[PDB]
Design a protein around this ligand. Structure first.
Ligand code: CLA
Ligand code: CLA
Ligand code: CLA
Ligand code: CLA
Ligand code: CLA
Ligand code: CLA
Ligand code: CLA
Ligand SMILES: CCCCCCCCCCCCCCCC(=O)OC[C@H](COP(=O)(O)OC[C@@H](O)CO)OC(=O)CCCCCCCCCCCCCCC
Ligand SMILES: CC1=C(/C=C/C(C)=C/C=C/C(C)=C/C=C/C=C(C)/C=C/C=C(C)/C=C/C2=C(C)C[C@@H](O)CC2(C)C)C(C)(C)C[C@H](O)C1
Ligand SMILES: CC1=C(/C=C/C(C)=C/C=C/C(C)=C/C=C/C=C(C)/C=C/C=C(C)/C=C/C2=C(C)C[C@@H](O)CC2(C)C)C(C)(C)C[C@H](O)C1
Ligand SMILES: CC1=C(/C=C/C(C)=C/C=C/C(C)=C/C=C/C=C(C)/C=C/C=C(C)/C=C/C2=C(C)CCCC2(C)C)C(C)(C)CCC1
Ligand code: SF4
Lengths: 105, 52, 177, 28, 104, 139, 34, 95, 138, 80
C-alpha cells in the first residue's frame, strides 16, 4: 500500500508542479510558444468540461421537471444583484487542469 | 524494488538508508543558507538596477 | 630504450587501473591513435579537395535558426556555415561506427581495451622491424608517421599563421586546390 | 582586439596548471 | 593556485569578451561586461534582452567592480588584461608545482 | 482463497496474488526476452534494444524544441541516439561494478554475459530508432 | 578555425561530457572492492 | 486459467452473454425525455454509434449525446456484469 | 541443535517478512513449545496461530525474534523459547538464552566483558590519546 | 560495532539487561556491590545503539555507556 502511494505521490508531484517549473523556465527564456497554456501546448480538462455540459443541458432533459441548473457555475446565465455579479459560468482551461493536479498531489 | 518484475533484475551494491541525524541537519542548513543568498542576491541587484 | 622503458613503468605505477586496460602510455593506445591519425590525414586531404572542386553545396551559406534551432549560434552572434555543419555530420557517421565497434566489437577485430588479464604488446622501440605487407609492423610504421604528420601540420599552422589546409595543399604542391 | 593566436597561447599555457594539478592531486 | 586561476579567468574573459576599452571612455554611462552568454536553451526574445550592452552578442553585466579597480591601478587596454591573465596562469602552475615538490 | 503465501512460505515478505502469480502474468513475463528460455545474452539485449529504441523517437519528435521545423524527425532521431548512448554507458557502469570473477550459472549475471547484453541493447536500440525513422519519414 | 567558435565547442564538453565522465569515474572508484 | 498461484478459476463466458442480454433488453424500453427521443437507451446508443461511424475519422464532439449514451449504457452493463459474476461465483462456491 | 523440519504457526502470509538479505547473509530462527493453540501478534505485523507443541519461525533480524520472545514471556507465560542465527552455508549458531539461563538472572560461569575499574568521570582527555589508537573509554 | 562499557559504579540492579532489545548484556557475579553482580556486555556485535540501557540505569552519572561507532548491517537495523 505505502510503496504504491509513495509512487503515485512522486508521479503526481512531477507531472503537476513540474509543469509550472517547465513554464517558468520557458517564459524566462523567452519561449512562450513552448509553454503549457491555452495559447501554446494545451492541457484541457475535457472530462470536467464534459460534466459541465451535462449539467447545463440537464434541466428539461435528464431532469425533466427541473426548470433551471443546480448551479450557474456549470453554464448558463450571468446572475447579477445591484450591478455586482452573484454567480456565472466558470470556464475550465489549462490553468484549471494544472491546479487540480496540484490538489490531487 | 525487490518484488517488481524486470526491475528486480537490477541490484544495488550499497544498501539504501535514510541520511544520518547529523547529515539531515547539515543538508537542511546548506539548503537554508544557499537559498538565503540566492534569494537576496537577485533582489539587491535587480532592485537597484530596476530603480536607477 | 632505458629512458622510455622507465617512463612506461613510472606511468604504470601512477595509473595502474588505466594502464591495465591499455589506456595511457601503452602500445595499445599508440596503435589505435596511429590508425585514427592515418584516417585523419586522408580526411583532411579529402576536405581540401572537396572544398577546391566545389563538392559541398552552398558552402559559405549560413544556417537558419528557425529551421535548425539554437545550436547554429556561435560565440559572438555568428552562425555556423553549411560547410562546417556538413563536415561535422561526416564525423558523426564514423563516431557512431566507433561507439558500436568499441562496445560491440566483431569477434575477430582488435578490441579497444585490454581483456581482464591480457598483457600489453611489447614496445616496438626506436625503429620497429621492417616487414613489408599488411603486418602489425607496417601498421605501426605508418601510424607513428601519420601522428608525427598531424603534430607537424598543426604546429606549423599556429607558428606560421597559415591554415592547416593551406599547409597541406602547399605540402602536396597545390594539387588539392 | 585579442587575436585567435592569443587565445590559443592561453589555452596551451593552461595545460601547464592542468598537468601540475593532476600531479599534485595524485600526490595528495 | 585556485585563487590565481580564478583571477586569471576574470582577466581573460574581460580581455576577450568584455568592453573595457569602450567603458573607460564613458565609465558612468556604459555598463561593464562580465562575460559572454552561450546557452542553447535561450529563445530569440531572451537573446535580444541580453544583447543591449553596446555589443552584438548576449552578455552578463559585471557587478564585481573589477573594471573600476583595474582602471584605477593603471590598466588601459585588453593587451594589459591579457598579459595579466597569462602571468597569473604561470603563478598558478608555480604554486601547484611547489605543492607537488613539498610532498617529495 | 485467492491470495496465498508466496512459494508456500508465509514468512517470506511477499504474497501470491492474481497480479503477480496468475496464469496470464506467468505467461507474459516468462516469454519476455529478459526471462525467455534458450536465449543468449546478446539476443536478449538485441530484442530489448529494438523495442525501446522504436518508441523513444515519439516524444522527441512530437514535443522537442524543433517539433515545428522541417527537420523535426531528424532532431527526434539524434535525441534518441543521445538517450541510447547514456543508457548504454549506464549498462556498462552497472556491469563493471556488479560482476567480477563470479561465473554464476544464470549467464547474464556475469561480466562477459552482461557485456554481450549491453552490445545487443546498443545495436538493437539504434536499429529500432532507425526503423521508426524510416516508417515516419515515409508516413 | 576562429575564436568565436569556441563557446559552441567548449560549453557542450564542459557541461555534457566532462561531468558525466567525472561522475562515471567517481562511481567506479567508490564501488571498487580492491 | 488460474486466477492465482495454484487456484483454478472458471471464467465462464455465459456470464457475459447473460449479463449483456439482461441489460440490453430492459434498457431498450422507450423513454419520453428529449435526449432519448422516443426510443430507449440501447437504441439511442446504437443510433449514435452509426451516425458517428458515418464520419469514420472524425471523432464525436464534446456536446455530442454519444458520450452520455455510452457512459449510461456501460454503467448499466457493468452493474449487471458485476452482480452476474458474483452470482455465478456464489453458484460455484466461491465465497 | 535446531531441527529444520519443526512445524510453523499458521499464518496467511504478509509483505513484512524476510527479503533477499535473509537468503544470502543471515537469518534468525525462534523455536518454542506451547501448551495450546493461541493467536499472537507477528512482529512483522498480523495475527498468527500458535500450534500446540513445537513452533518454528524465521525472521530477518535478531530484534524481531527477541521482540516475539518478550511477547511469548509477557502475554503467554512461555519462557522455553530459543533463538538461533542461520547462515546460507547451513551453519547454525545458538544465541539466546546463551547459557540456558536468561541474561537478567546472575549465573556463575559468566565472565565480565567490557567492564572498567573506574567511574565514568575518571576517563582521560581526548588530547592524551591524540595520534595513538587508544580511545578515552578503553 | 558500537562500544558498550560498564563502569564500577554499577549497583547490579539488572535494569539495563532487562531494557536491552538485542540481548547484548547480561549479569555476572561480582564483589563490588551489595547485589553481588555487575552488568556485562559480551555481545556488542548485536548492539543497535538504541541507548535503552542508559535510559534504564539509575546511577548518577551512568554506569553503562554506549559509544556509537562503526556501522554494520546489524547495527543499522536493516531487514533488507
Ligand atoms: C609525407 C610527408 C611530406 C613532407 C614533409 C613534404 C614536404 C614538402 N613538400 Mg611534398 N609531397 C608529399 C609528401 C610530403 N611533402 C606527397 C605524398 C606528395 C604527392 C605524392 C607531395 C608532392 C609535392 C609537390 C608537387 C611539391 C611538394 C613540395 C614540398 C615542400 C614544400 C615547401 C617548399 O616550398 O620548399 C616540402 C619540403 C614542393 C617542393 O618540392 O618545394 C619547392 C612541391 O612543389 N610536395
Ligand atoms: C509520451 C509521448 C509519446 C509521443 C508524443 C509518441 C508519438 C508517437 N508514437 Mg509512441 N509510444 C509511447 C509514447 C509516445 N509516443 C509510449 C510510452 C509507448 C509504449 C512503449 C509508445 C509505443 C508506440 C508504438 C508501438 C508506436 C508508437 C508510434 C508513435 C508515432 C505515431 C503515433 C500516431 O500518430 O498514431 C508518434 C510519433 C507509432 C510509430 O509510427 O512509430 C514509428 C508506433 O507504431 N508509439
Ligand atoms: C515534470 C514534468 C514535465 C513535463 C511533462 C515536461 C515536458 C516537456 N518538456 Mg519540460 N521541463 C521540466 C518539466 C517537464 N517538462 C522541468 C522541471 C524543467 C527544468 C527547468 C524543464 C525544462 C525543459 C527544457 C529546457 C525543455 C523542456 C522541453 C519539454 C518538452 C519535450 C521533452 C522531451 O522531449 O522529453 C523526452 C521524453 C521521454 C524520453 C519519455 C517521457 C516519458 C514516457 C512517455 C513515459 C511512458 C510511461 C508508460 C506510460 C509506461 C507504460 C508501461 C507498459 C504499458 C509497457 C515536453 C513538452 C523541451 C521543449 O522544447 O518544450 C516544448 C525543452 O527544450 N523542458
Ligand atoms: C550544461 C550544458 C548543457 C547543454 C550544452 C545542453 C544543450 C541542450 N539541451 Mg539542455 N539540459 C541541461 C544541460 C545542457 N543542455 C540540464 C542540466 C538539464 C536538466 C534541467 C537540461 C534539460 C533539457 C531538456 C528537457 C531539453 C534540453 C535540450 C537541449 C538541446 C536544445 C537545443 C536544441 O534545439 O537541440 C536539439 C537536440 C538535438 C539536435 C539532439 C542533440 C543530441 C546530442 C548530439 C547527443 C550527444 C550525446 C553525448 C555525445 C553522449 C556522451 C556523453 C557522456 C555519456 C560521456 C541542447 C542540445 C532539449 C533537447 O532537444 O534535448 C534532446 C530538451 O528538450 N535540455
Ligand atoms: C479504432 C481505431 C481508431 C482510429 C484509427 C482513430 C483515428 C482518429 N481519431 Mg479516434 N476514436 C476512436 C477510435 C479510432 N480513432 C474510439 C474508439 C473513440 C472513443 C469514442 C475515438 C474518439 C475520438 C475523439 C474525441 C477524436 C478522435 C480523433 C481521431 C483522429 C485524430 C484520428 C483520425 C480526433 C479527431 O480528429 O476527430 C475530430 C478527435 O477529436 N477519436
Ligand atoms: C443488477 C443485476 C443483478 C442484481 C441486483 C442481482 C442480485 C442478486 N443475485 Mg444475481 N445474477 C445476475 C444479476 C443480478 N443479481 C446475473 C446477470 C446472473 C447470471 C450470471 C446472476 C446469477 C445469480 C446466482 C446463481 C445467484 C444470484 C443471487 C443474487 C442475490 C444474492 C447475491 C448477490 O449478488 O447480492 C447482491 C446484493 C443485493 C442486491 C442487496 C444489497 C444492496 C445493493 C447491492 C446496494 C447497492 C448500492 C446502494 C441478489 C438478490 C444469489 C441468490 O441468493 O439468489 C436469490 C445466487 O445464488 N444471482
Ligand atoms: C463493494 C462491494 C464489493 C466489490 C467492489 C466487490 C468486487 C468484486 N467481487 Mg465481491 N463480493 C462482495 C462485495 C464486493 N465485491 C460481497 C458482499 C460478497 C458476498 C456475497 C462478494 C462475494 C463475491 C463472489 C462469490 C465473487 C466476487 C467477485 C468480485 C470481483 C468480480 C469481478 C467483476 O467485477 O466482473 C466484471 C470484483 C473484484 C468474483 C470474482 O472472483 O471475480 C474475479 C466472485 O466470484 N465477490
Ligand atoms: C588534457 C586534454 C583535454 C582535452 C579536452 C578537449 C576539449 C578542448 C578542445 C579545444 C579545441 C579548440 C582549441 C584548439 C583550436 C586551435 O588552436 O586550432 C588550431 C588549428 C587551426 O587551423 P586552421 O587551418 O583552422 O586555422 C589556422 C589559422 O587560420 C589561425 O591560426 O586547428 C587545429 O589544430 C584543429 C585540431 C585541434 C586539436 C586539438 C587537440 C584535441 C585532442 C586533445 C589533445 C590535448 C592534450 C595536449 C597534450 C597533453
Ligand atoms: C587528424 C584528424 C583526425 C585524427 C586525429 C588523430 C588521432 C590525431 C593524433 C595526433 C597524435 C596522437 C599526436 C601525438 C603526438 C605525440 C607527441 C609527439 C609525443 C611526445 C612525447 C615525448 C617525446 C615524451 C617525452 C618523455 C617524457 C614525457 C618523460 C621522460 O621520460 C622523457 C621522454 C620519454 C622523452 C580525426 C580521426 C579526428 C578526423 C579529423 O577529420 C582529422
Ligand atoms: C623532418 C622531420 C620532420 C617531420 C617530417 C614529416 C612532416 C613527417 C610527416 C609525415 C606525414 C605528413 C604523414 C604521412 C603519413 C600518412 C600516411 C601513413 C596515411 C596513411 C593512410 C592510410 C594507410 C590509408 C587510408 C585508408 C584508405 C586506403 C582509404 C579509406 O577508405 C580507408 C583507410 C584505411 C583509412 C620534423 C620537423 C617533425 C622532425 C623529424 O625529426 C623529421
Ligand atoms: C496500448 C496497449 C497496450 C500496450 C502496448 C505497448 C506497451 C506496446 C509496445 C510496443 C512496442 C514498443 C513495439 C516496438 C517495436 C519495434 C520494432 C518493430 C523494431 C524493429 C526493428 C527493425 C526492423 C530493425 C532493426 C535493425 C536495423 C534497422 C539494422 C541494424 C540493427 C537492427 C538489426 C537491430 C496493452 C497491450 C497493455 C493493452 C492494449 C493497449
Ligand atoms: S544500546 Fe540498545 S542494543 Fe545496545 S546494549 Fe544498550 S539497550 Fe542493548
Amino acid at each position: 500500500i505505502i510503496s504504491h502511494l509513495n509512487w503515485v505521490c512522486i508521479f503526481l508531484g512531477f507531472h503537476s508542479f513540474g509543469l509550472y517549473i517547465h513554464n517558468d523556465t520557458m517564459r524566462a527564456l523567452g519561449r512562450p510558444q513552448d509553454m503549457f497554456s491555452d495559447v501554446a501546448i494545451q492541457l484541457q480538462p475535457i472530462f470536467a468540461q464534459w460534466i459541465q455540459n451535462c449539467h447545463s443541458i440537464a434541466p428539461g432533459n435528464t431532469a425533466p421537471n427541473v426548470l433551471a441548473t443546480t448551479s450557474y457555475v456549470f453554464g448558463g446565465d450571468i446572475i447579477s444583484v445591484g450591478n455586482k455579479i452573484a454567480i456565472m459560468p466558470m470556464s475550465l482551461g489549462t490553468a484549471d487542469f494544472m491546479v487540480h493536479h496540484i490538489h490531487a498531489f | 524494488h525487490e518484488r517488481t518484475p524486470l526491475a528486480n533484475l537490477i541490484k544495488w551494491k550499497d544498501k539504501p538508508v535514510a541520511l544520518s541525524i547529523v547529515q539531515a541537519r547539515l543538508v537542511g542548513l546548506a539548503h537554508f543558507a544557499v537559498g538565503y543568498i540566492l534569494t537576496y542576491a537577485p533582489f539587491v541587484i535587480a532592485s537597484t538596477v530596476g530603480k536607477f | 630504450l632505458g629512458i622510455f622503458r622507465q617512463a612506461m613503468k613510472d606511468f604504470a605505477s601512477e595509473y595502474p587501473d588505466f594502464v591495465s586496460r591499455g589506456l595511457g602510455v601503452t602500445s595499445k593506445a599508440e596503435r589505435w591513435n596511429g590508425r585514427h591519425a592515418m584516417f585523419g590525414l586522408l580526411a583532411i586531404v579529402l576536405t581540401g579537395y572537396a572544398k577546391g572542386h566545389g563538392w559541398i553545396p552552398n558552402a559559405d551559406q549560413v544556417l537558419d535558426m528557425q529551421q535548425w534551432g539554437t545550436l547554429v549560434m556561435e560565440g559572438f552572434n555568428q552562425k555556423i556555415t553549411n560547410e562546417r555543419a556538413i563536415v561535422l555530420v561526416a564525423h558523426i557517421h564514423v563516431l557512431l561506427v566507433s561507439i558500436a565497434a568499441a562496445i560491440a566489437p566483431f569477434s575477430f577485430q582488435d578490441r579497444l581495451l585490454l581483456r581482464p588479464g591480457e598483457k600489453d604488446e611489447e614496445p616496438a622501440g626506436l625503429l620497429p622491424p621492417f616487414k613489408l605487407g599488411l603486418t602489425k609492423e607496417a601498421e605501426l610504421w605508418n601510424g607513428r608517421l601519420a601522428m608525427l604528420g598531424v603534430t607537424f601540420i598543426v604546429a606549423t599552422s599556429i607558428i606560421t599563421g597559415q591554415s592547416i589546409l593551406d599547409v597541406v595543399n602547399k605540402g602536396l604542391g597545390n594539387i588539392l586546390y | 582586439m585579442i587575436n585567435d593566436s592569443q587565445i590559443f597561447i592561453a589555452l596551451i599555457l593552461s595545460l601547464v596548471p592542468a598537468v601540475l594539478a593532476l600531479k599534485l592531486a595524485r600526490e595528495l | 593556485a585556485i585563487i590565481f586561476l580564478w583571477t586569471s579567468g576574470n582577466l581573460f574573459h574581460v580581455a576577450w569578451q568584455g568592453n573595457f576599452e569602450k567603458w573607460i571612455l564613458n565609465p558612468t554611462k556604459i555598463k561593464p561586461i562580465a562575460h559572454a552568454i552561450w546557452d542553447p536553451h535561450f529563445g530569440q526574445a531572451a537573446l535580444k534582452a541580453f544583447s543591449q550592452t553596446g555589443v552584438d552578442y548576449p552578455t552578463n553585466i559585471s557587478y564585481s567592480g573589477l573594471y573600476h579597480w583595474w582602471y584605477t591601478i593603471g590598466i588601459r587596454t585588453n593587451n594589459d588584461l591579457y598579459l595579466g591573465a597569462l602571468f597569473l596562469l604561470v603563478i598558478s602552475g608555480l604554486f601547484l608545482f611547489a605543492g607537488w615538490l613539498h610532498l617529495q | 482463497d485467492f491470495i496465498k503465501p508466496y512459494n508456500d512460505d508465509p514468512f517470506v515478505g511477499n504474497l501470491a496474488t492474481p497480479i503477480n502469480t496468475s496464469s496470464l502474468t506467468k505467461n507474459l513475463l516468462g516469454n519476455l526476452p529478459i526471462y525467455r528460455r534458450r536465449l543468449s545474452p546478446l539476443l536478449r539485449g538485441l530484442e530489448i534494444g529494438m523495442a525501446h529504441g522504436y518508441f523513444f523517437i515519439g516524444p522527441f519528435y512530437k514535443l522537442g524544441p524543433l517539433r515545428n521545423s522541417e527537420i523535426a524527425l531528424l532532431s527526434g532521431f539524434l535525441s534518441c541516439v543521445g538517450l541510447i548512448i547514456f543508457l548504454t554507458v549506464g549498462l556498462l557502469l552497472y556491469g563493471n561494478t556488479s560482476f567480477d570473477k563470479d561465473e554464476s550459472k544464470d549467464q547474464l549475471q556475469t561480466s562477459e554475459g552482461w557485456n554481450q547484453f549491453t552490445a545487443g541493447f546498443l545495436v538493437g536500440a539504434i536499429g529500432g530508432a532507425g526503423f521508426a525513422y524510416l516508417i515516419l519519414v515515409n508516413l | 578555425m576562429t575564436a568565436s567558435y569556441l563557446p559552441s565547442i567548449l560549453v557542450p564538453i564542459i557541461g555534457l561530457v566532462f561531468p558525466f565522465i567525472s561522475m562515471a569515474l567517481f562511481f567506479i572508484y567508490v564501488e571498487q572492492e580492491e | 486459467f488460474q486466477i492465482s498461484e495454484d487456484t483454478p478459476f472458471d471464467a465462464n463466458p455465459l456470464v457475459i452473454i447473460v449479463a449483456l442480454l439482461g441489460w440490453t433488453l430492459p434498457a431498450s424500453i422507450p423513454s419520453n425525455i428529449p435526449i432519448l427521443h422516443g426510443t430507449g437507451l440501447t437504441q439511442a446508443f446504437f443510433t449514435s454509434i452509426q451516425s458517428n461511424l458515418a464520419e469514420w475519422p472524425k471523432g464525436p464532439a464534446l456536446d455530442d449525446p454519444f458520450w452520455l449514451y455510452m457512459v449510461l449504457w456501460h454503467v448499466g452493463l457493468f452493474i449487471v456484469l458485476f452482480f452476474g459474476t458474483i452470482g455465478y461465483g456464489i453458484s460455484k462456491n466461491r465465497v | 541443535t535446531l531441527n529444520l523440519k519443526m512445524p510453523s504457526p499458521s499464518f496467511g502470509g504478509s509483505t513484512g517478512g524476510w527479503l533477499r538479505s535473509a537468503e544470502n547473509e543471515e537469518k534468525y530462527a525462534i523455536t518454542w513449545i506451547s501448551k495450546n493453540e493461541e493467536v499472537f501478534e507477528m512482529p512483522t505485523a498480523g495475527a498468527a496461530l500458535m500450534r500446540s507443541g513445537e513452533n518454528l519461525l524465521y525472521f530477518a533480524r535478531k530484534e524481531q525474534c527477541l521482540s516475539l520472545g518478550t511477547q511469548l514471556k509477557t502475554q503467554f507465560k512461555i519462557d522455553n523459547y530459543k533463538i538461533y542465527r542461520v547462515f546460507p552455508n547451513g551453519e547454525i549458531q545458538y544465541l539466546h538464552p546463551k547459557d540456558g539461563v536468561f541474561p537478567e538472572k546472575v549465573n556463575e560461569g559468566r565472565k565480565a566483558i567490557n567492564t572498567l575499574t573506574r567511574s565514568i568521570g575518571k576517563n582521560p582527555d581526548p588530547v592524551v590519546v591524540k595520534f595513538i589508537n587508544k580511545q578515552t573509554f578503553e | 560495532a558500537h562500544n558498550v562499557k560498564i563502569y564500577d559504579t554499577c549497583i547490579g540492579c539488572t535494569q539495563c539487561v532487562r531494557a536491552c532489545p538485542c540481548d547484548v548484556l547480561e549479569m555476572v557475579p561480582w564483589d563490588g556491590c551489595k547485589a553481588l553482580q555487575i552488568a556485562s556486555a559480551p555481545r556488542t556485535e548485536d548492539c543497535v545503539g538504541c541507548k535503552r540501557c542508559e535510559t534504564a540505569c539509575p546511577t548518577d552519572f551512568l554506569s553503562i555507556r554506549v559509544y556509537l561507532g562503526a556501522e554494520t548491517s546489524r547495527s543499522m537495523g536493516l531487514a533488507y
